[PDB]
Design a protein around this ligand. Structure first.
Ligand SMILES: OC[C@H]1O[C@@H](O[C@H]2[C@H](O)[C@@H](O)[C@@H](O)O[C@@H]2CO)[C@H](O)[C@@H](O)[C@H]1O
Lengths: 131, 128
C-alpha cells in the first residue's frame, strides 16, 4: 500500500486537465490510475495491463463495475517513465498517452467535480498537476 | 482541503508544492507527516501576524512552535514551496528565496501524509 498514492478533496471541474508523471516498476504486469468523486464512484478507472497487452478503462458505481472499454494500443512498458494527461469534460475523458496517442472514454457518472485520485500496482507517481 | 496519503518520502527527498493563496485569507497550512495526528511538519504562514509558524504534532500534543518573520508573499499569488526532508530537519525554500528550517522531532520513518488547509489551492505536487 506504500506508494499507492491517494489524493482526496481535489476540485477537478469539467474542462480541466490533470497531468501525471511516474515510473513504472520493472517486471510489473500492470497498474491503475483511478479518478472520480470518491472511492466507490470512479468516473475513470485507467488500467494498463502489460500482462494482457491492453489498456482497460471502466467506471465503478458502488460495488458494480461498468462495461469495460479495452484499447489494444499499449505501447509503453514495465520500467518506462511515463507521462499522461487526463482531460475531464462533462461528456467524456481524454487520456493522452506517452506517445501522443489519445484515448477517449465516456463519462458515465455525471459532471460533479472530481475529488479523488488513486494509484494501485506498479506505478510510482512522482508528480501531478491540475490545470 | 487536499490530502495525499501513502506517499513514500524518505530522508534526502524533496517535495515541491505549487498553489494559489486565496484572496483575503488570513493564512494557510501545509502539513507533512504520517497522519492527521502525527505531523512532523506543520507549516503555517499567517498574514495577520506577518510570520510563518511551524510546529510538530504528536497525537494530541503540539510541540514548541517556531516562528519565522520572513513572510514575503501574498494572497492572490501562485506560489511555490520546496520542502527537503532530512533526518534531523526540514528545509523549506520560500518563493522569495529565503530558506527556513524546522527540526524533525518524530524520527525518520518515511513521510506518507500531506495535507493542505486554509486559504491554499494546491495545483501541483512533485516528489523527488
Ligand atoms: O473492469 C475493470 C476491473 O476488472 C477486474 O478484472 C476483471 C476482468 O478485467 C474482466 O475480464 C472480468 O471478467 O473479471 C475481472 C474481475 O471483475 C479487475 O480486478 C479490476 O481491478 C478492474 O480493473
Amino acid at each position: 500500500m506504500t506508494g499507492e498514492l491517494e489524493v482526496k478533496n481535489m476540485d477537478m471541474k469539467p474542462g480541466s486537465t490533470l497531468k501525471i508523471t511516474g515510473s513504472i516498476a520493472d517486471g510489473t504486469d500492470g497498474f491503475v490510475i483511478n479518478l472520480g468523486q470518491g472511492t466507490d464512484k470512479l468516473n475513470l478507472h485507467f488500467n494498463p495491463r502489460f500482462s494482457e497487452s491492453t489498456i482497460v478503462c471502466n467506471s465503478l458505481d458502488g460495488s458494480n463495475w461498468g462495461q469495460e472499454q479495452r484499447e489494444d494500443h499499449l505501447c509503453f512498458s514495465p520500467g518506462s517513465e511515463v507521462k499522461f494527461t487526463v482531460t475531464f469534460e462533462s461528456d467524456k475523458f481524454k487520456v493522452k498517452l506517452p506517445d501522443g496517442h489519445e484515448l477517449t472514454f465516456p463519462n458515465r457518472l455525471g459532471h460533479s467535480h472530481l475529488s479523488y485520485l488513486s494509484v494501485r500496482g506498479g506505478f510510482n507517481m512522482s508528480s501531478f498537476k491540475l490545470k
